[PDB]
Design a protein around this ligand. Structure first.
Ligand code: ZN
Ligand code: ZN
Lengths: 30, 185, 78, 156, 183
């Protein structure tokens, strides 16, 4: 319900695509 | 890719040998339709397990595997699941459904014994495919726990209680039709 | 322990794999994100993150629960 | 050059009234197809089994093979676990149900032969989080009930 | 020309070693815990039980003995970086002092054997061997390489000399770097 909103908020706030990719790589490593 | 093995309980293997010996020697065939088709069986299964696994990944996997077994069972019926004898039942009902203005989807007629057939077909079907180690291992583990739950409830649908009543024991003896066209009349 | 990051073996010998199972594959810290190197997508990362944190949450909570209830039966034992 | 026809229906490896392909040597029955075709409803022109259809569809190129199998496994992205098994039946040939030998090694009370006969001797994520949190709420209430069961036994 | 196939994991091991002895200024920890003699003895003693025919065993033993002799004779000549020749000189000194000659197979580990292996094709193509004998040597070396790749997790760990201890590499002081490189 709200976690979809969390991931969309992160995708919006990062603003870029390479930065969002690096963010997803950090999340995968964890 | 690998050489995979699926730990199936021996009691259901005995039930399968009994199925084939009921359909081979006195060649009694199952009834169409069944009690409640494999759609209803898998729906019961997913209704039981979905309320007890917490994480979202596990339940996504469960839904995906149930749907997948559903469709794979409906497709592989006429190719490798049913025997040479009830092929005539299959083709006659297929011509019926072709006259019925829409194609037959076998998920609406058959029952659990064909699901057991597909469960025993699964291991070498997987071993003959190029799916990797972890993926095929997850798949065989899923089907393992599935037929374990099957073992949990062999009473409801597999054990034929009141066998003397023809409508309750889904095994029906054929008339001269398939006794003839089975072995070549 | 040490690295989860390989070296870049180019020369067009770097072969990719797209696993047929999405929500459980581990394979390395050596992924590549698509819309040996494992090809993975944002949806599987989402699911894996949420699954890990949910199950770790509930496991640590049941551990504290069992510890505290054992504590209460040990204290009332006196 | 015309090949020879195999007199056995490899679906059950038994002879009878059957027909064979124009490029494939092995023959099959009428009703052994999917859909099972009538003894009189013969197809118009040249008919092949799954094998020669596979051959003239693939253009004997592994590139086309992996291409259509890739966009196929991308088609079935909702059942991705079963996609590799799914792609095989649309090109595999039917043959009667024979459980492998690995099963019946438990009972000597059964006999078989070459006859094949037996004798007695997205909103998806929202729904997943729905289920996750409802079950965890269930179990946390039932775990405070666990500790309260311990306390009620302590009321002894 | 001769061609040898090395697994890419061992190629990355060699590139890592080239990175350490060069702009990280690290040397190896000697005497190693697993030396060349120990690796080759374990390999031969594990493989000699594999195939039955006596010819395979004769060829295996001859290859291992020749590899030992050749590493002994080649290490100081061609197998050392420029930073690691002061270490070689100090070992030579502390050996000659104790009236004992230096025997490199009982000191140096598996990374120097890997260096020798990697450089073998040029040394082979510089001699006047047969062609059958070159291909026999290359076959034996490729078999040794796959055996060693099966054990790579046992001889080539990463342990950060700067962090805990007993890694396969050690840091050098500024006196060692001053006398070794800039002298
Ligand atoms: Zn047939
Ligand atoms: Zn054909």
């Amino acid at each position: 319900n709200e976690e979809v909103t969390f991931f969309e908020k992160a995708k919006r706030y990062i603003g870029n695509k390479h930065l969002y990719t690096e963010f997803l790589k950090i999340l995968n490593l964890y | 890719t690998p050489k995979i093995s699926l730990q199936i309980p021996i009691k259901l293997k005995s039930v399968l040998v009994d199925d084939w010996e009921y359909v081979t020697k006195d060649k009694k065939i199952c009834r169409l339709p069944a009690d409640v088709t494999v759609e209803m069986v898998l729906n019961k299964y997913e209704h039981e397990v979905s309320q007890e696994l917490e994480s979202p990944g596990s339940q996504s996997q469960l839904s995906e595997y149930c749907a997948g077994l559903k469709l794979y069972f409906d497709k592989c019926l006429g190719n490798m699941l049913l025997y040479r004898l009830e092929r005539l039942q299959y083709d006659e009902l297929l011509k019926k459904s072709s006259k019925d203005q829409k194609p037959l989807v076998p998920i609406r007629i058959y029952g659990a014994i064909h699901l057991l057939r597909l469960i025993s077909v699964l291991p070498e079907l997987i071993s003959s495919t190029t799916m990797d180690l972890q993926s095929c291992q997850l798949l065989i583990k899923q089907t393992e726990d599935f037929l374990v739950w099957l073992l949990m409830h062999v009473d409801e649908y597999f054990n034929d209680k009141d066998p003397n009543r023809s409508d309750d024991a889904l095994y029906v003896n054929t008339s001269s039709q398939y006794e003839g066209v089975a072995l070549g009349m | 322990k040490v690295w989860k990051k390989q070296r870049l073996i180019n020369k067009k010998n770097q072969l990719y794999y797209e696993p047929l199972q999405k929500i459980g594959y581990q394979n390395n810290g050596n992924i590549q994100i698509i819309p040996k190197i494992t090809q993975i997508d944002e949806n599987s990362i989402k699911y894996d993150f949420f699954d890990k944190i949910y199950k770790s949450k509930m496991v640590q909570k049941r551990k504290l629960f069992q510890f505290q209830e054992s504590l209460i039966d040990k204290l009332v034992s006196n | 050059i015309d090949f020879e026809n195999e007199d056995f229906c490899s679906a059950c490896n038994q002879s009878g009234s059957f027909l064979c392909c124009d490029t494939c040597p092995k023959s099959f029955h009428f009703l052994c197809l999917d859909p099972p075709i009538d003894p009189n409803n013969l197809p118009k022109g040249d008919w092949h089994c799954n094998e020669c259809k596979f051959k003239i569809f693939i253009n004997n190129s592994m590139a086309t093979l992996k291409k259509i199998e890739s966009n196929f496994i991308k088609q079935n992205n909702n059942v991705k676990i079963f996609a590799k098994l799914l792609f095989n039946i649309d090109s595999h040939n039917p043959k009667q149900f024979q459980l492998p030998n690995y099963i019946k090694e438990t009972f000597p009370a059964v006999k078989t032969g070459s006859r094949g006969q037996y004798s007695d001797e997205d909103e998806n994520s929202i729904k997943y989080d729905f289920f996750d949190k409802i079950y965890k709420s269930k179990m946390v209430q039932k775990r405070k009930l666990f500790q309260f069961q311990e306390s009620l036994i302590d009321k002894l």
